Amino acid sequence: MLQKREKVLLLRTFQGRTLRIVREHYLRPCVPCHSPLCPQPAACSHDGKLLSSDVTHYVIPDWKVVQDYLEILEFPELKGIIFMQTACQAVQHQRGRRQYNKLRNLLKDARHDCILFANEFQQCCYLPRERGESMEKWQ
Amino acid sequence: MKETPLSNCERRFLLRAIEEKKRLDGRQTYDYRNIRISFGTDYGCCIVELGKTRVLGQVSCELVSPKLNRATEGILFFNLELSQMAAPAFEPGRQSDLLVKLNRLMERCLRNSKCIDTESLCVVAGEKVWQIRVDLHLLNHDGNIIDAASIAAIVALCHFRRPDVSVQGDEVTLYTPEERDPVPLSIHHMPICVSFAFFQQGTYLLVDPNEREERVMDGLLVIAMNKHREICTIQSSGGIMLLKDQVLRCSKIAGVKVAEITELILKALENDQKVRKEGGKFGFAESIANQRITAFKMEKAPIDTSDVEEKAEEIIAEAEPPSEVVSTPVLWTPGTAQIGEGVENSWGDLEDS
RNA sequence: UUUUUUUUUUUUUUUUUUUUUUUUUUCUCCUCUUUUUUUUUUUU
Structure with a gap:
């Protein structure tokens, strides 16, 4: 099912100490899209607030x-x-x-x-950073 | 030396008893051995006796600089200790696999429950704050060391009274019990340990076991849970293999027992405060039973200090004065000098060459 | 009128040890309205 990936981070503490903490990320096949024209109901079943x-x-x-x-x-x-x-x-x-x-x-x-929407927990909408970047452009 | 071995007749008899649901000292399954507390004279010092076990608790505080990070709290040491006199086996460095599990149980209970208010123990931040330090000693081992140690630590922490300070502007000052009255502490809840023993593969259980019953048991279950209905630690250990209904039954039992124990502790502390406030006499001395053969009391006594001058005078007068052969120091060369019978030559030279 | 023989519960005990509470994060943050600020006085 899920597909593990990693995310590094650069946290700066109050004392001036930064660290390369590494953390997790788990993708999924089916992120609900909470829409009334999703061409398959069951796979997510849309159990929440739903547009018209x-x-x-x-x-x-x-x-x-x-x-x-x-x-x-x-x-x-x-x-x-x-x-x-x-x-x-x-x-x-x-x-x-x-x-x-x-x-x-x-x-x-x-x-x-x-x-x-769970952009970041869906299996083909997630993209990893590349050589030469910024939060804005990646975003 | 080691402790006396266990025969094969006592094991059979204890297990026949446990099967029959009758214990040695008469008390039924869900009972404690009755308790008896006694307070010192300076604050934060008590002696608890559960059955025939003794623990000595003593709290003490001190003012230090608060490490780096956590600039607005205080630290809280603990140090359990097992006295060589508690039992034959205890040896200063040969029982190092009970100390660890005991210190851990005690610390996880007392420090992770967050009942002591270590928020309000600061004076400045980045500067001097109070560092409390609990201390327990085991005096007599008769089983269930941890219930007694927990009650002792509770009472010792709920009977302490700090020093007190004046802080205004950027200036310190430290008072004393005559300049300013010692101040109490802030205690949120009362975490009290309970122990259970399991016998012949979980088929029977017995609350609060003593030392023979501790050597005929499979494993132990401890459930530490403060007043109201809130559990604070559990630690299965020994040789046990447990079910799921039993943990819940045990939790109920520990609830009941901690209710009763907190009742008792509150009543005893109240009585002690009433005594201290009336104006009567308190302390370890006025606790010794007088209706008993093994106690004796003696008020003061001037002995007769009428003669010491004369005796000392005659003794000094009646003995031989220092003699008067005075010795001479010899000088060899600046740096070294000799006194005594001396050496024949000035110094050795070409003695063997 | 049916003789003779087919062993049995491992040997061992006279080993040294010079540590010590904890332990390791979470950001910047719009405090609403008669005012200067009244003030002696006496009964506690």
């Missing part, structure tokens, strides 16, 4: 459009939003706890069309 198809389109900020412009995306007229987990992780590890709590209340709410 009426919209014209679907808009996905890359990471920044939800980092700062978040205050826009609450209006109950906006419909058809899906968040890539990598943006959520960016905002969590970059914007403290207030913005993240607002985002997670947004998600945890049956009033809007917001869902979350």
Whole structure:
């Protein structure tokens, strides 16, 4: 089933000590996509909050459009939003706890069309870094 | 030396008893041997007696600099010890595979439960903070060392009283019991150990076993669980192979027993505080039974210190004065001098060449 | 009117040891509104 991979990290402690901690990562075949046009119900069974198809389109900020412009995306007229987990992780590890709590209340709410996607736990959407890079471009 | 061996008649008799559900000293299955606490005079010192076991607890604090990292807490030593006098076998460096499991049980219980409040033991950060240091000794071994050691550590920590300090601006000051009153500690909960013994492959169990019953058993189960209903450590050990209903039964039993033990401890500490506050006499001395053949008491006595001057004077006067042959020091060459019968020549030279 | 023979529970005991609580992370963070700030006085 799963496919092990690794992730190195460079944590800087308060005393000025950095370290190359290594950690894990487990991919999967079937990440639920929480959509009403998924061409196979059973494999994930969609056990959560589920959209209803009426919209014209679907808009996905890359990471920044939800980092700062978040205050826009609450209006109950906006419909058809899906968040890539990598943006959520960016905002969590970059914007403290207030913005993240607002985002997670947004998600945890049956009033809007917001869902979350496991970009990073799906087996062919994950990509490893390469020679010469940055968080923005990889992102 | 070693300890007396176990015969083959006592084993048969103990197992016939256990099969018949009757114990040596009369107490039924779910019982403890009754307890008896006694407090010293300076704070944080007690003597607990479970049955015929003795443990001595003594707490003591001291002010040090708090390592690097964890700049806003204090450290907490512990040191169990087994006294050569506890039993024949104990030997200062020949019983090194019981000390480890005992220190570990004690430390995991007391330090991982987070009942002592090591938050509020700072004065500055990066600077001097209090370093407490618990100390236990075993005096007489009669089985179940860890229940008694745990009750002892609990009472010793719940009877201590720190020094106390004034901190304002950037300036220190240290008081004393006459300048300022010693201060208590903050204790969240009361983690109290319980032990169970299993007999002939888990078919029977007996609560709180003594030393003969400890040599006719397969394995031991310990369940450390503070008041309310909250378990804090478990450690199966010995030779046992357990089921799943039994751990739960044991947890119930330990619940009951820790309830009763905490009742007792609270009552005893209360009585002790009442005695200390009324204004009566306390201490190890006024605890010795007087209704007993093996105790005797004697109040003070001036003996007669009327004669020592005369005796000393006559003794000094009545003995031979220092003599008066004075010796001479000889000088060979700056750096070395000799005193005594001396040597014939100035120094040796070409003695053999 | 049916003689004679077919061994049995391993030998051994008179070995030295000079340590010591723990142990190893988690980021920056919008404190709302009559004010200067009142003040003697006496009964505790």
